[PDB]
Amino acid sequence: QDLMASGNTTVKATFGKDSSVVKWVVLAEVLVGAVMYMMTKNVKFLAGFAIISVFIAVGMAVVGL
Amino acid sequence: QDLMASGNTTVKATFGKDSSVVKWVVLAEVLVGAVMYMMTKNVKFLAGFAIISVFIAVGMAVVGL
Amino acid sequence: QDLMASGNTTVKATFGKDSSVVKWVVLAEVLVGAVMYMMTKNVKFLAGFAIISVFIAVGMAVVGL
Amino acid sequence: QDLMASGNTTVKATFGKDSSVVKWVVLAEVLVGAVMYMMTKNVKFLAGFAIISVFIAVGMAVVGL
Amino acid sequence: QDLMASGNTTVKATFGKDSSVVKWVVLAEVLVGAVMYMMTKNVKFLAGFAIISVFIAVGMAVVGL
Amino acid sequence: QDLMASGNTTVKATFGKDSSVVKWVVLAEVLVGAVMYMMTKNVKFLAGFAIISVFIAVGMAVVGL
Amino acid sequence: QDLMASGNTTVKATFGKDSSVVKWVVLAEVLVGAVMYMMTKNVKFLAGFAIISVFIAVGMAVVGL
Amino acid sequence: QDLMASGNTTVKATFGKDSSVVKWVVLAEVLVGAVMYMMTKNVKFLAGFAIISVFIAVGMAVVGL
Amino acid sequence: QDLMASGNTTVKATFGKDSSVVKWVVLAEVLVGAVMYMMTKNVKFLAGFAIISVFIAVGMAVVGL
Amino acid sequence: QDLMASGNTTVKATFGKDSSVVKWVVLAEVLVGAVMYMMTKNVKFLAGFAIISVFIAVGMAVVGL
Amino acid sequence: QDLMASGNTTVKATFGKDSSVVKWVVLAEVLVGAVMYMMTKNVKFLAGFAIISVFIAVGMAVVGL
Amino acid sequence: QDLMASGNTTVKATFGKDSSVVKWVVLAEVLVGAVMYMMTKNVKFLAGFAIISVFIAVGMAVVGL
Amino acid sequence: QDLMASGNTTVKATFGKDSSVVKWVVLAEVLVGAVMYMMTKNVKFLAGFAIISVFIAVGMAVVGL
Amino acid sequence: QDLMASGNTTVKATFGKDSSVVKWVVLAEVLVGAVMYMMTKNVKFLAGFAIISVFIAVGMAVVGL
Amino acid sequence: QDLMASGNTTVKATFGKDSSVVKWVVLAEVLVGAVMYMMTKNVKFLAGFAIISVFIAVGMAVVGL
Amino acid sequence: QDLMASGNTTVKATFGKDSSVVKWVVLAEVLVGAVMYMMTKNVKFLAGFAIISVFIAVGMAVVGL
Amino acid sequence: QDLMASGNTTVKATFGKDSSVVKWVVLAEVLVGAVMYMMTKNVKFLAGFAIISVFIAVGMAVVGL
Amino acid sequence: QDLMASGNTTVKATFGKDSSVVKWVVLAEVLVGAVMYMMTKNVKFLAGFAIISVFIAVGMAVVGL
Amino acid sequence: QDLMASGNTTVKATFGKDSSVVKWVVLAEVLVGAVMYMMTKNVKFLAGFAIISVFIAVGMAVVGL
């Protein structure tokens, strides 16, 4: 029949590829990496900056409801 | 005779390989891992991202009602 | 529907390309590098000085809500 | 809205192009270089003496709140 | 009809975006983070300082009675 | 109506920008950093010395009851 | 009203610009630096010797209850 | 009131300008330098021999309880 | 009228600023810290040594019956 | 009246400036430091050797029943 | 009265200036230093060889029960 | 009484001036120095060859149980 | 009988010699090595570039489901 | 008689030398090592790659039901 | 089946032979080498300038998704 | 799709054939060479003076975004 | 009378200076040290190899029922 | 009586001077040293190659059940 | 009895005097040395080229299972 947890899925809107929360993540990510680099002065922290984004993309693309 | 817990199995629809709940899981999984990585900056948390999915797949394939 | 974490986004104002915090970062960055150079006397630490800025720019441009 | 870290920015006064701290830096810089030269007797250490200053200037000019 | 728990909602006044309690929270938050940093000397604890505030804001904005 | 946790706010006097406790913090902060430097002999620990102060200032300015 | 942590401030006497503890610090500082130099034979460790003192002075002057 | 770490200051006697420990330092200092010179045959190591002494003197004179 | 738990307050004598128990506390405190330092060899445990004392003082001064 | 935990204070005799236990502490302290130095070959561990002693002294002098 | 940890002090015999354990220490100390020198070929490790001994002596002389 | 670590001292036999281990040391010492000289062709490595031996001798003579 | 984890093995497709993930690896590998070389200017980092590939190949060939 | 846990031993099929799961292991093993090497650039992680395999082999050969 | 990390591969666009990032690399490479040469005045640093490019080319050609 | 690091490329403006930084380089290059020649009085240091320029040119021409 | 835990003391036979278990210990000890050295290539792990043995000996000699 | 851990001692066969495991050790030892030398090009790693063997021998000879 | 790690020893085949891996080693060894010589132009790196081989031989001959 109907799976009862169905419907809704503003969950998607909530978490969607376009969503506040998503944008939140990389934001602080951008920060801390930039932060960390001051401390470290190593080239490390600029990756998931891009990577998590596409990482986000793929899993979002993977699941995407 | 008839096992009385039988019938129904919208349970399947509820939990099925295609189900809200399933999609829910990996979603937050994608999140927390991405979250964790900001904190950790270790390559760890991108696995069950894929793995749990196929892990889901196999057990779902294992049982599948 | 409406993703509930939406609205607000003074978060943007908070973290925006024009924001206090952003300006904070490079500031101390300028410092420590200048600091470090006294110790090191190597040409190293003048990069993210510029780079993080454009690094900031791109990610800000990448996400930008 | 209002980014909450805003206001204040005696931070600027604290770190500004005219600030104690800034003047502190080059001071010791002048020292150690002069110090180092006694040891080294190489022409090295008189640079950021001027350079960091303009380096300070540019980043200060770069960010400048 | 009338939901009996209704009325009142000095609860709001009690817990509102403007309320003592709210202000209480971030206060001690400011403290402990500043406290922690002495111990840790890591850049960690200055976040919910801002973040919880907007976190407060959003949930307050989310529910807001 | 009246939020019951209201009134009082000697809490402010207790924790205010001018308060014992506040002054307590930076004090020990000054100490441990000076302490740490003996051990480390790195330029690290003189920051929140100033920074926490303005950090205190801003959050105090942020909330300030 | 009265902030309860107030009064006392033999804390000041305890930690004051004139205090045992303060004098303790630079003392061992003088030692270890002199110690270190034997090992290192680098001109490094004679700084906070003076610097921490004025560093002490400023923060003491900064807070000073 | 009375700073509790006060009194005592056999600490002074312990570490004083006249103290065993002080005399200990320069002693081994004299040694290692003389030692080092055998290896190095450079004129380096005869400095803090005198210098640390006056260095000791000044900091001792600086703090001197 | 008369609060029945009143009178007595040898409780004070029992717990007073001058009391056995009070003196007991810091004693073992002195011990364990000294103990701990052997294990740790970190400068940590000498604080409440002084601090708890004044901490004791203030709360004692705070309440003091 | 009489604070009941009073009397006794063989506790003092037990823990006193002259006591077995006290002497016990520095003993093992002397050991482990000497031990550690074999491993480390750093000049670190000879401090509380003297310091804890006077540290003991002061707190003992601080409290001293 | 009598401090209960008193008596015994075969502890002394155990750890005394003449004791097995004491002799144990310098022994391995002699070894590792001699060991280390093979690796290092630096004049470092022959010190506490003598020094710890007198270091032992003094602390033993310091405490000596 | 009796220090419990006493007795035994086949430890001596184990490590004694006449012991396998002792002889082991200088052996490899002889080797590596001879080895090193091939590489270096400097007169360096023939010292503790003799020196460690007498170094061994003295410390052995120093402690010698 | 049938091993239940069997079937599936899109795992292979997932991780196969031809797979996204595989290609991902060497990619970043190419990067970081090229990155590192800028810093190091040593010939080091161009190996697993080729090597991991054949390393991948062999293990893939080793297991290959 | 018959040990009741007997029979079955599709467990073997499940875990056998030829089994999905087994192949799973080394797979990710191949990955992480290759992964790690990018980070480390040390020759470490290519061992159990082969070794665990034969390690698997032996224990499998050891037990093998 | 379908390897879930598949699709996407704007990763390619991201990192492709034609990509911003790629161009970024050699750029700074050109810089630092030119920089280094001022310091060194050795012919060293003009290699990966060309070499990394073809190095990039080959690995890109090697993997190229 | 769109490579996310794209756009921006004021990076070019930043580092372009016409850019401050570029002009900076050769400047100091001109200096140090002229400097060096005083010391050396060898004809060496006038090369990258021209050469780096065309070296700059070619790599700039090579990459040029 | 008779202490009831008495008798038995095959415990001795179990744990005695000659016992399986004892021999077990040093065995694995020999292993891991030899193991560790491969990893470390430091001279560390060959000690309790001998030492624990005599350590065993002494405690065994100490207690020995 | 009989120490219960007795008997067995295929443990010996397991770990004996002639045992697989033993031979395993030196094997990888031979490898890594040879490996290391490529990296280091120092004469270091050929020792326990022989030494551990006799080290094995002696401890094996020491315990040998 | 039977040492359980026994049997197998395709380990030998794996690592044997004739084995892939062995041949792998010297190969890259040949490379890097030839590589290094370009950089160094010293006669150094052609040794273990031959030496490791016989070094391999001896240890292989030493252990050889």
Author numbering:
A (entry chain 2E), B (entry chain 2F), C (entry chain 2D), D (entry chain 2C), E (entry chain 3F), F (entry chain 3E), ...: 6 to 70
From the paper:
During the process of helical reconstruction, as the resolution was increased, an additional separate density became clearly visible and readily interpretable as a phospholipid. For the F pilus, it became apparent during the process of helical reconstruction that two populations of filaments were present, differing slightly in the rise between subunits (see below). Instead, two 5.0 Å resolution electron density maps were generated for the two F pilus populations. For pED208, the angle between adjacent subunits is 28.2° and the rise is 12.1 Å, while for the two F pilus structures, the helical parameters were 27.9° with a rise of 13.2 Å and 28.1° with a rise of 12.5 Å, respectively. Superposition of the structures of pED208 and F TraA reveals very similar overall structures (root-mean-squared deviation in Cα positions between pED208 and F [13.2 Å rise] of 1.4 Å and between pED208 and F [12.5 Å rise] of 1.5 Å) with slightly different boundaries for secondary structures. Also, the TraA pilin structures in the two F pilus forms are virtually identical (root-mean-squared deviation in Cα positions of 0.7 Å). Thus, with the structures and helical parameters of the two F pilus forms being so similar, functional differences between them are unlikely to arise but cannot be excluded. The amino acid sequences of both the orthologous pED208 and F pilus TraA pilin are similar, except for the F pilin N terminus, which is 4 amino acids (aa) longer. This longer N terminus could not be traced in the F pilus density maps and thus must be disordered. Indeed, the presence of phospholipid in the F pilus was also confirmed by MS; however, this time a PG species, PG 33:1 (16:0, ΔC17:0), was the major phospholipid observed in the F pilus after PLA2 treatment.
Conjugative pili are widespread bacterial appendages that play important roles in horizontal gene transfer, in spread of antibiotic resistance genes, and as sites of phage attachment. The pilus is a polymer of the VirB2 protein (or pilin). The structures of the pED208 and F pilus are very similar, with overall dimensions of 87 Å in diameter and an internal lumen of 28 Å in diameter. Thus, selective binding of PG to pilins occurs in both F and pED208 pili, and thus, the F family of pili are polymers of a selective and stoichiometric protein-PG complex unit.
